[PDB]
Amino acid sequence: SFPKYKPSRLATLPATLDPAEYDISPETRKAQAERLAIRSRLKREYLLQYNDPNRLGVIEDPALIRWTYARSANIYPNFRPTPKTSLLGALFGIGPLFFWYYVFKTDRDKKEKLIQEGKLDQTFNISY
Amino acid sequence: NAYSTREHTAYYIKALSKDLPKAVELLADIVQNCSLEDSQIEKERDVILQELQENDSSMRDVVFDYLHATAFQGTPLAQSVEGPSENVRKLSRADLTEYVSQHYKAPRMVLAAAGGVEHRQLLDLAQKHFSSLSGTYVEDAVPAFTPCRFTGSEIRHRDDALPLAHVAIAVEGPGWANPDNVPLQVANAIIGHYDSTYGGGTHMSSTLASVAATRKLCQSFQTFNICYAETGLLGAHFVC
Amino acid sequence: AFSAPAAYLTHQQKVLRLYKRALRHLESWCVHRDKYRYFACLMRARFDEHKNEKDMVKATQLLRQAEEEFWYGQHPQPYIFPESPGGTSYERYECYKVPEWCLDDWHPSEKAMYPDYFAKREQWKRLRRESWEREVKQLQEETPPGGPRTEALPPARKEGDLPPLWWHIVTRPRERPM
Amino acid sequence: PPLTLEAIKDRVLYVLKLYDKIDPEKLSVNSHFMKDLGLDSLDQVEIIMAMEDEFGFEIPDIDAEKLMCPQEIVDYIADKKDVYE
DSSP: OOOOOOOBTTBOOOSTTOTTTTSOOHHHHHHHHHHHHHHHHHHHHHHHHHTOSSOOSOOOOHHHHHHHHHHHTSTGGGOOOOHHHHHHHHHHHHHHHHHHHHHHHHHHHHHHHHHHTTOSOOSSOOOO | OEEEOSSOEEEOOOOOGGGHHHHHHHHHHHHTOOOOOHHHHHHHHHHHHHHHHHHTTOHHHHHHHHHHHHHTTTSGGGSOSSOOHHHHHHOOHHHHHHHHHHHOOGGGOOOOOOSSOOHHHHHHHHHHHHSSOOOOOGGGOOOOOOOOOOOOOOOOOOOTTSSSOEEEEEEEEOOSSOTTHHHHHHHHHHHOOEETTOSOGGGOSOHHHHHHHHHTOOSEEEEEEEEOSSOEEEEEEEEO | OOOOOOSSOOHHHHHHHHHHHHHHHHHHHOOSHHHHHHHHHHHHHHHHHTTTOOOHHHHHHHHHHHHHHHHHHOOSSOOOOTTSTTSTTTTTTTTTOOOGGGGGGSOHHHHHHSHHHHHHHHHHHHHHHHHHHHHHHHHHHHSOSSOOOSSOOOOOOSTTOOOSSOHHHHTOOOSSOO | OOOOHHHHHHHHHHHHHTOSSSOGGGOOTTOOTTTTSOOOHHHHHHHHHHHHHHHSOOOOHHHHHTOOSHHHHHHHHHHHHTOOO
C-alpha cells in the first residue's frame, strides 16, 4: 500500500493510475472506436490535401480559424453583464488602480512632508 | 427455483440423485443457451411490472430497500434487484443478452451439489455440459468491482394510513470475509428477535424482547447482519 | 514510420507496456548490469506468477495494483535514450531538417551547381504527378462507405502503382541532414 | 559509423545468438520468435529492449510489438537510421 498520488490541476492523474481505465464497458469501447473514426477521417482529409502534387499554399485548418475567432471576436457577443462578471470586472479593473493610488499618494505625501520640515537629504540630488 | 440478490444470482434444481445428469444438462442449458425470445420478453415485462406493484404491499421489503437506498446512496448497492419500473418497460433483448454475456462467466459461476452426489460424476458432467462457457470478455470489456460508500442518512416515507410503522436502522458492518462477523453475530443473537406470536414473552432473556412483550411495544423486532463483499448493514428492524 | 494507433489497448498490450516501463525504471535504479539482471529475472518471475490467471477481473485488479506500485517506485530521473522524447538530443537536428519543396525556389545558378541531382528530382516529381490520380482512385475504392475508420493506408494493389499517400513518408528529411 | 544494412543484420543476429532461450543453430533472419521459435510475448519485449539497448535508439511500443521477426527489426532500424545500403 504505497502512498497514493493526489492529482492536482498542475499535476494531472496518470492514465496508469486512472480509476476508470480498469472499469471498461461495451459503450466505452464503442465510443473509443467512434473517436478513432473521427480522427481517421480528419487525418485522411488532411493527408489527401497535404500530399496533393498540385496544392500550393496553406491547408486552411477550420479549427485554427475557430480558435482565433472564439478567442477574439466571439467574446463580447457572448458576454452578459452578470454578478460574477460585474464583480470580477470591478475588482480586477478598478481595484488595482486605487491600490496603486493609495500607495503612491501616501509615499509622495510623506516625501512632501519631510521636504517641508527640512528633514530629507538631497545633498547631491541635483539631477531630477 | 432461482433467487436473485444484490450480490448473487442462483438457479438450483431439487431432484433425485439418479436424475443428476439430466439436472446438470438442464442447468447448463438454462445458464448458457437461454433463448431470451422477444415475445416472452414482453410477457415478462408485464409480469415484472405487476410484481413491482405487488412488492409495494410488502412493508418489510420496502423498508429494507429504503435502507439500502439511504445507506448506500450514490453507489450500485442502493439499486433494488427488481429495478425501477421505467427500466423494466425500457429493457430490450439486446440489454438482456449483454447482461448475460458480461456477467454470466465461468470464473464467476459455481456449480454446487449436496446429497447423493459423487464429486467425480458431477465433475465429469460439468466438463461435458459446462465446458463451453468461457470467461473471456468481448472486446476486453471487463466489469470492475467498486467499493460502496456508506452514508448516514434517514429516509422517512410518512403514510399515516398504514396500520403499523416499519423502521430499519443499521450501521456499516464488516464484509463477508471480515473475521469480526462472528462476534457481531453473537452480539446480535444477544440482542435477539421478538414477534408478538413468540411464546416466551416477558421471561425471554433478551431485554428488548422482554420489555416489548411486557409493554407490548412492538409487534415484531429482529436483528439483521446483512453482509456484502466490502460493506454490510448491521442493525435491527422493528414493526411497532 | 509509426503505425496507426488502435482505438483501445488490449490487456496484453497494457501488460507488455507495464513490463517495459518497469524494466527500464529498474535499470535506472539498478545502474550496474549484474544487479539489473538479477532483479530483472525477479520481475519476469513476478509476471509469470500470474501469467495464466483465468479470471479477467482479477487480472485487471492486478494490473491496477502493479501500476500503483510502478508510480510509487518510478525513478525520479529515469534514463531516456539520447534521441528519444525527453532525451538530451531529442529534436536537436530539427532546424537542420529542411523540406524538399524549398529546392524548387533555388535560383537557376544554384540549381546549376548540382545538375544530376535536380534531373533525378525532376524524375521523382514526374513519378508523383503521374501517381496521384491512381492513388486517389484506390483510396476512394478501398475506403468504406461511412469513411476511413482507421489511419492505416492500403498498399499498392497492382504493379505500376505506388502506395497511396507516399510522397511525404518517402521524401521525409534525413534524420541527420547537416 | 556508416551503420550499413549488413552491419545491422549482423548485430541483431549477434544479440539474438547471445540470447540463451533462442538456440543459435536454428536462428534465422526469417525465424519468427512467436511461431518458428518458442519465445512468448514477454520474450518479445525483452528482445526488443535488447535491440534498442544495442543500437541506442528506443523503438516505440506500438511499433515494437509488431516486429515479430529479426529481419523486421533490421529493416525498422534501417528506416529509423536512414540506411539505404
